[PDB]
Amino acid sequence: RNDFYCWVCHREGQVLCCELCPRVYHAKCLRLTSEPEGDWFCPECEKITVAECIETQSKAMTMLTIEQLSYLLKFAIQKMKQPGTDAFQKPVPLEQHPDYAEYIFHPMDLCTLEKNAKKKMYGCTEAFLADAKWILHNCIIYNGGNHKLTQIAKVVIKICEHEMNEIEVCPECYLAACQKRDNWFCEPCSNPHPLVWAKLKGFPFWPAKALRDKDGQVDARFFGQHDRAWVPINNCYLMSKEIPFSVKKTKSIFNSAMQEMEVYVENIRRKFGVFNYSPFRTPYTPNSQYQMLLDPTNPSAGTAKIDKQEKVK
């Protein structure tokens, strides 16, 4: 059955109906410049359709099957199920709230979300977050926008958004961080992340993995502490033997990071055959392939990796 409360503001009124799902919307809540006539599809449905289309699907979805994604969604559910989330763990019982179904036409809870994931119902990360949001919408309608339970539901949805974002950055890094095997941070991914010297304003130059490029910034993951930051691309150099020196407080902390970085380099050499160090102060470039070159003085010769047509798992 179609909902009666706007998906955006959670209030009743004159609302448009989606043809594909039970969601309804005030026209003004979607800043709709005009009125749709017939066969309207809502923004949640339209975002899911383009994320599930092979021609427009994300980098992460190109490397995952539906079954593989369902395994990562199970770990995301564990992160959402924090201490204090009891009210959202099981379906709301009619024995405690007999008027619940007069207001809530589409119930949702963490156990149902978990069961749906195990049954392979979600074809993209966007679909899991869209379904999870029914928990927050339902809580606002029944309990009210200022209730203590609404505050808890908002955090549950913010955790869901962060976990979906992390899967999209790199599913292999996500899986390694979830399992936490010995020296998981040093495990190379199938398309290995470039190693750089990264300088964040106010901090010493430090070794890091480069996970993404966006608007002139690099998503750096630092060796040692495993913390993260967006760093300007002009403050990043390809890894070299000579170190870009910075005045530091504790020697041993920098030492542990350099030691961990050398374990990562050895893992790359064992798996792909090579690791090319660069001359001092060589700028990092987006999606750099330098470290994998057969001959770093002849880039047109391409990668050292031998293609054995292996099904990667």
Binding-site members for Zn(2+) are: 6, 9, 18, 21, 26, 29, 42, 45, 170, 173, 189
The nearest distance, CB 248 to Zn ion, in angstroms, is: 28
Q: How many residues bind Zn ion (CB under 5 A)?
A: 15
Single out the residue of 282, 304, 291 nearest to residue 209, CA to CA. Answer: 291
- What residues are designated binding site? 6, 9, 18, 21, 26, 29, 42, 45, 170, 173, 189
Q: Rule CB under 5 A: is residue 173 a binding residue for Zn ion?
A: yes
Choose between 16 and 29: whose C-beta lies nearer to Zn ion. 29
Q: Rule CB under 5 A: is residue 29 a binding residue for Zn ion?
A: yes
Q: Rule CB under 5 A: is residue 16 a binding residue for Zn ion?
A: no
Among 3, 5, 24, 42, binds Zn ion (CB under 5 A): 42
Q: Rule CB under 5 A: is residue 18 a binding residue for Zn ion?
A: yes
Q: Rule CB under 5 A: is residue 169 a binding residue for Zn ion?
A: no
Q: Rule CB under 5 A: is residue 220 a binding residue for Zn ion?
A: no
- Pick the stretch among 27-35, 112-120, 266-274, 303-311 that binds Zn ion (CB under 5 A): 27-35
Choose between 23 and 199: whose C-beta lies nearer to Zn ion. 23
x-marked contacts with Zn ion along 174-213 as a string, rule CB under 5 A: ---------------x------------------------
The nearest distance, CB 42 to Zn ion, in angstroms, is: 3
HEC string of the chain equals CCCCCCCCCCCCCCCEECCCCCCEECCHHHCCCCCCCCCCCCHHHHHHHHHHCCCCCCHHHHCCCHHHHHHHHHHHHHHHCCCCCHHHCCCCCCCCCCCHHHHCCCCCCHHHHHHHHHCCCCCCHHHHHHHHHHHHHHHHHHHCCCCHHHHHHHHHHHHHHHHHHHHHHCHHHHHHHHHCCCCHHHCCCCCCCCEEEECCCCCCCEEEEEEEEECCEEEEEECCCCCEEEEEHHHEEECCCCCCCCCCCCHHHHHHHHHHHHHHHHHHHHHHCCCCCCCCCCECCCCCCHHHECCCCCHHHCECCCCCCCCCC
Among 3, 5, 6, 292, binds Zn ion (CB under 5 A): 6
CA distance 106 to 275: 53
Q: Rule CB under 5 A: is residue 92 a binding residue for Zn ion?
A: no
Q: Rule CB under 5 A: is residue 21 a binding residue for Zn ion?
A: yes
The nearest distance, CB 29 to Zn ion, in angstroms, is: 3
Q: Rule CB under 5 A: is residue 260 a binding residue for Zn ion?
A: no
Choose between 96 and 146: whose C-beta lies nearer to Zn ion. 146
Single out the residue of 134, 127, 141, 135 nearest to residue 57, CA to CA. Answer: 127
Residues that bind Zn ion (CB under 5 A): 6, 8-9, 18, 20-21, 23, 26, 29, 42, 45, 170, 172-173, 189
